Amino acid sequence: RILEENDKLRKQGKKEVEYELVLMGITRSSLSTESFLSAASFQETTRVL
Amino acid sequence: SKKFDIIKISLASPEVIRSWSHGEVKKPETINYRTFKPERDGLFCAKIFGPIKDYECLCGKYKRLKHRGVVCERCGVEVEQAKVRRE
Amino acid sequence: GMTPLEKKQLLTDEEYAEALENYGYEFEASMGAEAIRDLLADTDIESEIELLQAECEESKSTAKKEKAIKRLRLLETFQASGNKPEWMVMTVLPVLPPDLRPLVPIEGGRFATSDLNDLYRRVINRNNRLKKLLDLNAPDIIVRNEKRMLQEAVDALLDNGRRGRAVTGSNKRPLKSLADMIKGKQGRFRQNLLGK
Amino acid sequence: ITPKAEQQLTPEERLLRAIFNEKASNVVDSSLRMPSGTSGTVINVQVFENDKG
Amino acid sequence: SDDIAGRSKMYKNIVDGKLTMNVDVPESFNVLRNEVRALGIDMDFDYSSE
Amino acid sequence: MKVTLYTTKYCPYSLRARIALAEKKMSTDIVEAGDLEPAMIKKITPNGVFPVLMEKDYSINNRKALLIYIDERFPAPSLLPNVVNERIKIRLSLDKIDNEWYPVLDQIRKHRSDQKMLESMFKDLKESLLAMEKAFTGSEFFISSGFTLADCYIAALIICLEAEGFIIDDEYGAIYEYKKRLFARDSVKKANILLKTLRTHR
Amino acid sequence: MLLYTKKDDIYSDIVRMILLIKGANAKIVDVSKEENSKHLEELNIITPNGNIPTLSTDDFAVYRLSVIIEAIEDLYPFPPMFPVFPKQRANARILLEYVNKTFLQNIIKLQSPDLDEKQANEIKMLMQRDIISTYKKIVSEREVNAESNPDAQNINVLTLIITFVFYYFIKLKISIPTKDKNIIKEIKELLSEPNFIKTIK
Amino acid sequence: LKGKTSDPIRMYMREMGIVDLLDKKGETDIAIRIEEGTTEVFSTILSYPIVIKTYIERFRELEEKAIDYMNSENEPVARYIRFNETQRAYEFFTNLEKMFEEYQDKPNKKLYTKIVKEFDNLRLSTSHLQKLVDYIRLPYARVKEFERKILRLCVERSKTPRQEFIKVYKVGSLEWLEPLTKKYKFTENTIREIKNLTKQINQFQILMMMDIEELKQVNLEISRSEAKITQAKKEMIEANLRLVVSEAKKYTNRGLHFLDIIQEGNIGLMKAVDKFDYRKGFKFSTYATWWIRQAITRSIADQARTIRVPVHMIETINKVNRIKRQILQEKGREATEEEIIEHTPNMSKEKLKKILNISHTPISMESPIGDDEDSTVGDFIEDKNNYSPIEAANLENLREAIKELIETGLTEREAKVLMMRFGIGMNTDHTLEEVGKQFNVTRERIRQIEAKALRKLKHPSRSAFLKTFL
DNA sequence: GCCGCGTCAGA
DNA sequence: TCTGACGCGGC
DNA sequence: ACCTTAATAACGCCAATAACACAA
DNA sequence: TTGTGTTATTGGCGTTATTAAGGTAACTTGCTTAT
Ligand SMILES: [Zn+2]
């Protein structure tokens, strides 16, 4: 939603994106976040680090 | 900014790992047996990691306010607050 | 080398001997961490990225190129960061300030070591004996045994129990290795950072 | 009581030793005292001496 | 709990009776950055302009 | 703990620091600044004044207080006089040696290109040394009772100038009672070059 | 224990402040004053180039304000002008030498009568340029010196030095190119130092 | 088989028992093999002139370090040079010196044979032999140092040829870099440096002999002979790896696990093989177990603990222990230290009061406590060497107190004097003769001023209030 | 391209 | 015990 | 498990020297 | 305020108790340690 809008008017729209929502569990959507600190605190620390 | 506001993680080259090292460990020793003082260049070497008391070398010679930033010469001990044995 | 062998070609001892017989020099097949490190070292990226991206441009990822997708990301990351990929094989490992693995004396005229002191005290004298051996020019069998014992102690220090039958002290407990301090409910994150 | 050493006391401690002629004792006491919030009396005092002496 | 400066600082502010607070950073986090640094991992504070 | 000093070749202050360090009864890694990678050489200090130092948390270069920092950081037997007035005079002597000594080495190095220019300079160097001979006699190393830093200062003008075809001990007038008493020191006997060879050059 | 001086000279008035700090036997004597031609000649006898200032005792005479101030400090254990930690001492030394070379030399230059237009202009430009950096580094140094020992009743000499740099900057009708309220308010508060008044009058 | 099994002990035992056990015949055969290899390298060493003069020179060094003794009724003893040859040694050396003089002057064949035969008379096992082979090697080492150095100095500047090596490589010349005026390497400082190094090169050769090929081949032949000997000893040691493991079954839990035990054994064996001569008809197995046992027990005494302990203190402890068990299983009673000493070579009655005070290996901080409210020892040790926020608040209440107390005393003077003479916000705590100069006067009554200040401060107007802090 | 058999990670 | 995400070997 | 030897760092020494004190 | 008496230290000295090193030549040859 940010990179689409990056292209959306900067170049022309440069054929931004086509996507489709996907459904993932709560733990799966938990570890899959951005901040590596929170994820590393949650569980499975070795792997994320 | 006076306050850090990002945190990053990365691999440590053998040139960073040396840059962190205030010395080098050579013999598997921790502490003298009869008297409990640290040993020369083991795992508690006060010459590397730091002094034990505050503003006082190990051999106890350089013990006075006249000399603070000073580095003793009998033992290689520096002279500074013991609070560096953790960093 | 001109010899028709392949780079990442495992060779048994006798087949290796026969390669030595028929071709002598012009190729080296060493064993041990130096081998892996040399391989990772002489592994050009731009020789490989596009070469694999073209096999992925041959996209039939039903079962085969469902595999080759990750290597793209890995090799791109290693290019993006600026990290020498051979750095994943250590040549000098650091030690921890002593006041994080203390030896304070307590009642009963006794002392309280930390489990890290022991693993350190092991890796050290194993390195020492290794240096002494390499000096004295011993036969290669015991050279191998030392060079392997060392790897074992290093892995134990990092996190024992990942591969073997993790070492124990006299009390027969599996020792509390380095990584075992920053995970688990009793570890470091959800114990003393959200605890207090 | 238990002995100690390594004072190298602060300048101000030095001065105040030097005003009241306060000597610096080398010993420190570590007695045994009932912890706070308790009371009572005594009923038996066992004492065990040294060996070979 | 574990701000070595802040402990004594606040215990002083109280007995005197003024208002101030200094909260630089806890100690357990420095311990963590050490323990992770005792591996080939380089965790560290930094700044950003992008 | 550990401490190393990066140095170049044929420099007065480089040898100055070398002698001072050798005197303090210490142990250091000596690295010749020419054997590093050029980009690495410059990344050491982007400007570049070769004799600097290397400690774990500090790096000092400016060749005016460097020797002072040495004299203070290891107060093992000093390089400055104990009695205050001597301490004051010697530093002004250091100013004499420092503020006006460029033509003594730099000009005879670079500007004197004609052998005629060199020798015409040499006559003035000789006569200036002779004019200086009407000075200190019998003093231990300088105005002093014991060994001082200026002692370790003149050794550079000794060695580097010996390296410029100016051997002058008796063809130098009456400054010989110490100029020979100088090299009776262990530390100063690091200027330049069977069992002795194998034993010593290690 | 005598100090030859010369009005309208940053060096002499700097050492005058340093002396008034101790309030020592400031047996002050000028040079350009015709009431002491004989003693001016005397100075010229006891020094090669008649540099001012110059400290004289019954034991020696000195010049080169670095040596001057350091000898004063060797001489008076009065509330001092230096740190206690060798690293900080060396850093103070180097910064002093830097600001000296970069500013006081140019000040001595534009103190000349035979100046030019372009020269005075470019010099004042560089001074207005670098004053800010000098001040910032100096206050930084002050802070870090102080953290390692509080309530030490010890004065940092480089602050006085920068005070006199600013004071002469005022006394020669030049602009200070800043816009910070903090910068200027701390400047003015600095200039209002009590024992500093003792001489500027 | 190579079947993913991780634990190394098997991956070592497998290869260990591969090659066959041998008989006395094979043992003595490989022994005479190593012996003739050593005699080859020995004989081929001393066929060069400078060797014996350097030998004599080292004897001269021992001569002066011997004369350094009467400065403090024999020739001063030091025979760390030769093993099992001092009057005979010295006299033989005198003959060596004089005959070697005549050798370096006159002859061609005869006296060289004479000196090699009188060397055949001598006896040196492995130390001094290696001393001599280094006597030869180290010169080649240093000259190769200088070669590598001159290369690194010139080759990465002098147009970076790196492949015209055959033209430049002519050594000991100092006649090639002058055309380099019309070539690259604008390297004047480097020019005088490489000339210095080549000077030293020719000087070393002058000390020794003609050009590098006078020593390169010597070192080559030495390498060859030494490789023969090395292969012989390797075959020898590889034949009895099982002896190590067999003996290392007793010491198995005394503090060290098995692998390092085995390694220490193999060290003590490899050190044993080369000092065992076939000249006596015996069994290698007999003599080698001595060295195996020495190595294993030494390593055990060394690294069996965290708090290291000297080895004599450990064997004495073992002796005490054996005595204690002997008496316990004989008279029922336990200690009766009177008996422990009543028959003992310890020959002390106080060391025992200390030899067993170090008898507790440190507990480990991570031992749970069974039920015991479910904790561990590693959370009952506490910080003891710091200042608890109360121990560091009753200080500033004093650090600032007197800083005001004095501000109601002297006008200014006694304040200055107490600060300078006690040290408060100062850097040194100056001495009487320093304040004596601070005020230009009063070298002595400065003490009077401080006495007055102190007598002025001990007044209940100012005294009893502070009296708390002590 | 898949029917069973592993390791890891939390309970 | 499990529950699965994720495998990576027989066919 | 037992020696037989160099080698090292703690411990006692009495003078020197820099510093402090105490009567007029 | 200047003379004559301590003292507190401080590098030198020797002393030796303590630690580290090395060497024996009757023949001796492959655990797996346990819900
Ligand atoms: Zn010390």
Spatial separation of the C-alpha atoms in residues F79 and G148, rounded to whole Å: 27
Question: What letter would DSSP give residue E39?
Answer: T
Spatial separation of the C-alpha atoms in residues B79 and B54, rounded to whole Å: 8
**Cβ atoms < 10 Å from Cβ of F56:** 14
> Residue H262 is which amino acid?
I
Spatial separation of the C-alpha atoms in residues E14 and B83, rounded to whole Å: 25
Are residues F55 and F90 located together in one domain of the fold? no
| Collapsed DSSP state (helix, strand, coil) of residue B31 | strand
Structure tokens at H129: 């032999």
CA of H392: which chain E residue's CA is closest?
Answer: E8
Residue F14 lies inside a defined structural domain of this protein: yes
Spatial separation of the C-alpha atoms in residues C117 and C105, rounded to whole Å: 15
Pairing of strands C110-113, C105-106: antiparallel
Facing C117 at nearest CB: one of B11, B27, B43: B43
Spatial separation of the C-alpha atoms in residues G76 and D29, rounded to whole Å: 45
Spatial separation of the C-alpha atoms in residues H293 and H300, rounded to whole Å: 11
Q: Which residues of B2-34 are buried (b: 16+ CB within 10 A; e: fewer)?
A: eeeeeeeeebbbeebbeeeebeebeebbbbbee
Are residues F93 and F181 located together in one domain of the fold? yes
Whether the Cβ atoms of residue H52 and residue H100 lie closer than 8 Å to each other: yes
Spatial separation of the C-alpha atoms in residues F121 and F132, rounded to whole Å: 16
Residue with tokens 């240093």: H142
Spatial separation of the C-alpha atoms in residues C34 and C40, rounded to whole Å: 10
> Does the distance separating the beta carbons of G153 and H425 come in below 8 Å?
yes
Nearest to H312 by CA among C113, B38, B33: B33
H395 near E CB under 8 A: no
Pairing of strands E44-46, F4-7: unpaired
> Residue H280 is which amino acid?
K
Task: For chain E, give the longest Cα–Cα distance.
Answer: 47
> Residue H444 is which amino acid?
E
Check which CATH number belongs to the domain holding F40 and give it: 3.40.30.10
| Collapsed DSSP state (helix, strand, coil) of residue B43 | coil
Are residues F157 and F65 located together in one domain of the fold? no
How many domains, in total, are found in chain F?
Answer: 2
Q: What are phi and psi of C99, to 5 degrees?
A: -75, 10
Question: What letter would DSSP give residue H368?
Answer: B
Contacts 24+ apart (CB under 8 A), C20-28: C26/C1, C26/C2, C27/C1, C27/C3
Whether the Cβ atoms of residue H86 and residue H73 lie closer than 8 Å to each other: no
Spatial separation of the C-alpha atoms in residues H206 and H172, rounded to whole Å: 11
Return the sign of the alpha-carbon dihedral for residues G129, G131, G134, G138.
negative
**Cβ atoms < 10 Å from Cβ of B87:** 14
Residue F194 lies inside a defined structural domain of this protein: no
> Does the distance separating the beta carbons of G77 and H430 come in below 8 Å?
yes
Spatial separation of the C-alpha atoms in residues F97 and F91, rounded to whole Å: 10
Nearest to C17 by CA among C26, C4, C29, C7: C29
Chain mean position to CA A35: 11
CA angle H439, H442, H445 (to 5 degrees): 130
Are residues F92 and F177 located together in one domain of the fold? yes
**Cβ atoms < 10 Å from Cβ of E25:** 14
Chain mean position to CA H5: 38
Residue F201 lies inside a defined structural domain of this protein: no
Spatial separation of the C-alpha atoms in residues B55 and B46, rounded to whole Å: 13
Cα Rg, chain G, nearest whole Å: 18
Length of chain D: 53
Tally the C-alpha atoms within 13 A of residue C48's C-alpha that lie toward its C-beta. 14
Residue B84 burial (10 A CB sphere; 0-12, 13-18, 19+):
middle
Pairing of strands G54-56, E44-46: unpaired
Spatial separation of the C-alpha atoms in residues G2 and H440, rounded to whole Å: 13
Facing G78 at nearest CB: one of H425, H428, H438: H438
From chain F, the residues in CB contact with H139 under 8 A are 198
Spatial separation of the C-alpha atoms in residues C69 and C55, rounded to whole Å: 10
Spatial separation of the C-alpha atoms in residues G53 and G12, rounded to whole Å: 5
Spatial separation of the C-alpha atoms in residues G187 and G181, rounded to whole Å: 10
Tally the C-alpha atoms within 13 A of residue B1's C-alpha that lie toward its C-beta. 9
Resolution (A): 3.5
Structure tokens at H327: 């008496």
Q: Which residues of H423-452 are buried (b: 16+ CB within 10 A; e: fewer)?
A: bbebbebbeeebbbebbeebeeebeebbee
How far, in Å, are F128, F162, H91 from residue F116 at the CA level?
Answer: 18, 19, 63
Q: How far is the CA of H395 from the centre of ligand 1 (A)?
A: 29
Are residues F134 and F66 located together in one domain of the fold? no
Q: Torsion angle, CA of H453/H457/H458/H461, rounded to 10 degrees?
A: 150
Whether the Cβ atoms of residue H319 and residue H302 lie closer than 8 Å to each other: no
**Partners of residue F29 on adjacent β-strands:** F4
CA angle G137, G139, G143 (to 5 degrees): 115
Structure tokens at G50: 């008649």
Q: How far is the CA of B33 from the centre of ligand 1 (A)?
A: 20
Are residues F89 and F180 located together in one domain of the fold? yes
Domain boundaries, chain G: 1-81+194-201, 82-193
Identify the H or E element spanning G66.
helix G65-75
Are residues F25 and F100 located together in one domain of the fold? no
**Partners of residue G55 on adjacent β-strands:** G3, G62
Q: Torsion angle, CA of F124/F127/F131/F137, rounded to 10 degrees?
A: 120
> Residue H116 is which amino acid?
V
Give the determination technique. Answer: cryo-EM
State which residues form the domain around F179: 84-189
Mutate one of A31, A36, A45 to test the C interface: name it (highest C CB count within 10 A): A45
Structure tokens at G96: 């002093």
Structure tokens at C119: 């693993």
Identify the H or E element spanning G4.
strand G2-4
> Residue C74 is which amino acid?
L
Structure tokens at B49: 């990691």
Residue B70 burial (10 A CB sphere; 0-12, 13-18, 19+):
buried
Residue with tokens 């503003």: B55
Return the sign of the alpha-carbon dihedral for residues F42, F46, F52, F54.
negative
Pairing of strands F29-32, G2-4: unpaired
Residue F156 lies inside a defined structural domain of this protein: yes
A35 near C CB under 8 A: no
Residue A43 burial (10 A CB sphere; 0-12, 13-18, 19+):
middle
Spatial separation of the C-alpha atoms in residues H306 and H423, rounded to whole Å: 44
Helix, strand, coil percentages in chain E from 3-state DSSP, rounded to 5: 45, 10, 45
Whether the Cβ atoms of residue H365 and residue H376 lie closer than 8 Å to each other: yes
Nearest nucleotide relative to C67: CA against C1':
J8
Chain mean position to CA G96: 10
Spatial separation of the C-alpha atoms in residues H440 and G76, rounded to whole Å: 10
Structure tokens at G21: 């700090």
Q: Which residues of C88-100 are buried (b: 16+ CB within 10 A; e: fewer)?
A: eebeebbbbbbbb
Nearest to H133 by CA among H27, H41, H20: H41
| Collapsed DSSP state (helix, strand, coil) of residue B7 | strand
Residue with tokens 């190394």: H8
Residue with tokens 């000296």: G100
Spatial separation of the C-alpha atoms in residues H310 and H302, rounded to whole Å: 8
| Collapsed DSSP state (helix, strand, coil) of residue G94 | helix
Whether the Cβ atoms of residue G199 and residue G16 lie closer than 8 Å to each other: yes
Check which CATH number belongs to the domain holding F98 and give it: 1.20.1050.10
Facing H422 at nearest CB: one of D11, D20, D22: D11
| Touching pair C, E by Cβ (3+ pairs < 8 Å) | yes
- Of F41, F73, F105, the one marking the end of a domain is F73
Whether the Cβ atoms of residue H416 and residue H442 lie closer than 8 Å to each other: no
Nearest to B50 by CA among B73, B26, B71: B71
How far, in Å, are A6, A8, A10, C52, H87 from residue A15 at the CA level?
Answer: 11, 8, 12, 26, 102
Q: Torsion angle, CA of B59/B64/B67/B71, rounded to 10 degrees?
A: 10
Chain mean position to CA G151: 25
Are residues F24 and F118 located together in one domain of the fold? no
Structure tokens at H251: 């010491």
Residue F40 lies inside a defined structural domain of this protein: yes
Nearest to F184 by CA among F147, F130, F131, F132: F147
**Partners of residue H350 on adjacent β-strands:** none
Spatial separation of the C-alpha atoms in residues G118 and G110, rounded to whole Å: 12
Nearest nucleotide relative to H293: CA against C1':
K1
Are residues F100 and F37 located together in one domain of the fold? no
Spatial separation of the C-alpha atoms in residues G76 and H439, rounded to whole Å: 9
Identify the H or E element spanning G106.
helix G105-110
Nearest to G190 by CA among G168, G159, G157, G144: G159
In three state form, how does the secondary structure of F62-103 look?
A: CCCCHHHHHHHHCCCCCCCCCCHHHHHHHHHHHHHHHHCCHH
Kindly give, in sequence order, each residue whose CB lies less than 8 Å from that of residue F112, ignoring residues fewer than 6 positions away: F118, F121
Are residues F107 and F55 located together in one domain of the fold? no
Whether the Cβ atoms of residue H157 and residue H187 lie closer than 8 Å to each other: yes
Residue F44 lies inside a defined structural domain of this protein: yes
Structure tokens at C98: 């002593």
Kindly give, in sequence order, each residue whose CB lies less than 8 Å from that of residue G187, ignoring residues fewer than 6 positions away: G166, G176
Whether the Cβ atoms of residue G95 and residue G141 lie closer than 8 Å to each other: yes
- Of F51, F73, F95, the one marking the end of a domain is F73
| Collapsed DSSP state (helix, strand, coil) of residue H403 | helix
> Residue C22 is which amino acid?
N
- Of F73, F101, F123, the one marking the end of a domain is F73
Sheet containing G54-56, strands listed edge to edge, beginning at the edge strand earlier in sequence: G27-29, G2-4, G54-56, G61-62
**Partners of residue E41 on adjacent β-strands:** B11
Q: How far is the CA of B63 from the centre of ligand 1 (A)?
A: 9
CA angle C72, C73, C76 (to 5 degrees): 85
| Touching pair D, E by Cβ (3+ pairs < 8 Å) | no
Structure tokens at H47: 């066929």
What does the DSSP assignment read for D1-40? -EE-------HHHHHHHHHTT----SEE-----PPTT---
F73 near B CB under 8 A: yes
CA angle A28, A30, A32 (to 5 degrees): 70
Structure tokens at F20: 């001072």
Are residues F37 and F126 located together in one domain of the fold? no
Structure tokens at F171: 């063809």
**A 15-44: CB within 7 Å of strand J:** 25, 28
